[PDB]
Design an enzyme around this catalytic site. Structure first.
Site, PDB file in Angstrom:
ATOM      1  N   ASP A 170       6.751  27.874  84.347  1.00 20.18           N
ATOM      2  CA  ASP A 170       7.027  28.516  83.158  1.00 20.18           C
ATOM      3  C   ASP A 170       7.145  27.472  82.081  1.00 20.18           C
ATOM      4  OD1 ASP A 170       7.407  29.867  80.821  1.00 20.18           O
ATOM      5  OD2 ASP A 170       8.631  31.401  81.970  1.00 20.18           O
ATOM      6  N   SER A 186       1.950  23.089  64.639  1.00 23.20           N
ATOM      7  CA  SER A 186       0.976  22.800  64.377  1.00 23.20           C
ATOM      8  C   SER A 186       0.666  22.713  63.474  1.00 23.20           C
ATOM      9  CB  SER A 186       0.090  23.992  64.642  1.00 23.20           C
ATOM     10  OG  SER A 186      -1.111  24.217  64.670  1.00 23.20           O
TER      11      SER A 186
HETATM   12  N1  LIG Z   1       6.208  35.252  79.002  1.00 24.57           N
HETATM   13  C1  LIG Z   1       6.943  36.029  80.083  1.00 24.57           C
HETATM   14  C2  LIG Z   1       6.763  37.013  80.632  1.00 24.57           C
HETATM   15  C3  LIG Z   1       6.755  37.027  81.936  1.00 24.57           C
HETATM   16  C4  LIG Z   1       7.787  36.163  82.935  1.00 24.57           C
HETATM   17  F1  LIG Z   1       7.744  36.387  83.873  1.00 24.57           F
HETATM   18  C5  LIG Z   1       7.370  34.718  82.376  1.00 24.57           C
HETATM   19  N2  LIG Z   1       6.925  34.601  80.672  1.00 24.57           N
END
Ligand SMILES: Nc1ccc(F)cn1
Length: 330
Positions: free
Chosen positions: A35, A199
Site C-alpha cells: 500500500d 497531473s
Molecule cells: N484506501 C484503503 C482502504 C483500505 C486499506 F486497507 C488501504 N487503503
C-alpha cells in the site's frame, strides 16, 4: 541489493493486489497488500480475535526465533474506506523476493474490522507511503522501504500491476524491459506523508486533452481512480445510461456498454487507461447495472490515482534525496 516479487489480483475484478512476504525465522509466508497510501506493516496473527479471522494466514510471533516484542508499543489505523485494525508490535526479519530487512517492525493485529475478516485473501498490509504516517506509539516505526533504502542498488521501488494478470513489485532497480518509451518524472510533495503529485490534465476517449492541474496521490492501496466531480462528470457523460447513484454510492452504467478510455497527464506525457479497466462489474449479483472505476473525490478531500490508473503504467517510487514519481506506458 535488490528484491523482486510477483503481485496478483485477489479476484476477477482486480479489487486489490497481494504479494508474498516472508516473516520471521523459519519463514512464515503471508500474502500482503502493498500500500503506497499508508505506512504500517500489519498482519493477521495468533493474537487476532478468533471471530475476526476467517481464512487468512496468520503470523505466530512465538514460533519465530528472531521475533522480539517491542516494549509498550501499540498501533491503531483507520483507512479511507471506514476499515480499521490495531494491536501490538514485534520487530522481526522481513523479506520481499530476495530482499531482507532485519529488525522490521511487524504490527501484529489483536483487532480487525469486518472488511478485513471478509477478505480471506489478504493476510495484512505492507505500507509504502512515508514513515511520518506510521501509527506506532509511543515510538514511531519505519516502513520496509525506508529500512532497505540504504542497502538498495538505487533508492527506488517500482509498481507494475496487471489488468486481470500477474504483475511485479521491484525494489532497488528499474527493469528497462517492463515499459515502452521513456519514464517521465514528476515532482512529489511529502507534506501529507503521501506520494502526492500533480497531473497535468486529462482526456476522455478520443476527445481533446484538457490542461488542468490535478493534485492527487499515487496509491496502490486504493482500488479505484478518484478525481474531481467536474472531471468524473465529463467522463460519465460519454457513457449512455450512466448516472450517479446515491443508493449504490457512485456512478453506475449499463453492463452492456463499451467504456471509453481515460487519459491522464504526467508532464508532457500521457498515460491511457483502457475502457475495460474502468468496469467493476454488476452492482449486485445478477444485476445488469455495473459499477464505475472512475469516481468523484468530493467526499474524500484528496484525488486518488489508485489501481485503476496505476495498472495502466510502470510506476517508479523514487526515494532519492528529493523523492519523485516516474510514469511510463507499458
Ligand atoms: N484506501 C484503503 C482502504 C483500505 C486499506 F486497507 C488501504 N487503503
Amino acid at each position: 541489493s535488490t528484491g523482486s516479487a510477483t503481485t496478483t489480483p485477489i479476484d476477477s475484478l482486480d479489487d486489490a493486489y497481494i504479494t508474498p512476504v516472508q516473516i520471521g525465522t523459519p519463514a512464515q509466508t503471508l500474502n500482503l497488500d502493498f500500500d503506497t497510501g499508508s505506512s504500517d506493516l500489519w498482519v493477521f496473527s495468533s493474537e487476532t480475535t478468533a471471530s475476526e479471522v476467517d481464512g487468512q494466514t496468520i503470523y505466530t510471533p512465538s514460533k519465530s526465533t528472531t521475533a522480539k516484542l517491542l516494549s509498550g508499543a501499540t498501533w491503531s489505523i483507520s483507512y479511507g474506506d471506514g476499515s480499521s485494525s490495531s494491536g501490538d508490535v514485534y520487530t522481526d526479519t522481513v523479506s520481499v523476493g530476495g530482499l531482507t530487512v532485519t529488525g522490521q517492525a511487524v504490527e501484529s493485529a489483536k483487532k480487525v474490522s469486518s472488511s478485513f475478516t471478509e477478505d480471506s485473501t489478504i493476510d495484512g498490509l505492507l505500507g509504502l507511503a512515508f514513515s511520518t504516517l506510521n501509527t506506532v506509539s509511543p515510538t514511531q516505526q519505519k516502513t520496509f522501504f525506508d529500512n532497505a533504502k540504504a542497502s538498495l542498488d538505487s533508492p527506488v521501488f517500482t509498481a507494475d500491476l496487471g489488468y486481470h494478470a500477474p504483475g511485479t513489485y521491484n525494489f532497488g532497480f528499474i527493469d528497462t524491459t517492463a515499459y515502452t518509451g521513456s519514464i517521465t518524472y514528476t515532482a512529489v510533495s511529502t507534506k501529507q506523508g503521501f506520494w502526492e503529485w500533480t497531473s497535468t490534465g486529462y482526456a476522455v476517449g478520443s476527445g481533446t486533452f484538457k490542461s488542468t492541474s490535478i493534485d492527487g496521490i499515487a496509491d496502490t492501496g486504493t482500488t479505484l481512480l478518484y478525481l474531481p466531480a467536474t472531471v468524473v462528470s465529463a467522463y460519465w457523460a460519454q457513457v449512455s445510461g450512466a448516472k450517479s447513484s446515491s443508493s449504490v454510492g457512485g456512478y453506475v452504467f449499463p453492463c452492456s456498454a463499451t467504456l471509453p478510455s481515460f487519459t491522464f497527464g504526467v508532464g508532457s506525457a500521457r498515460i491511457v487507461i483502457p475502457g475495460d479497466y474502468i468496469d467493476f462489474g454488476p452492482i449486485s449479483t445478477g444485476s445488469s447495472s455495473c459499477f464505475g472505476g472512475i469516481q468523484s473525490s468530493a467526499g474524500i478531500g484528496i484525488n486518488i490515482f489508485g489501481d485503476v490508473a496505476l495498472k495502466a503504467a510502470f510506476v517508479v517510487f523514487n526515494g532519492a534525496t528529493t523523492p519523485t514519481l516516474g510514469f511510463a506506458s507499458k
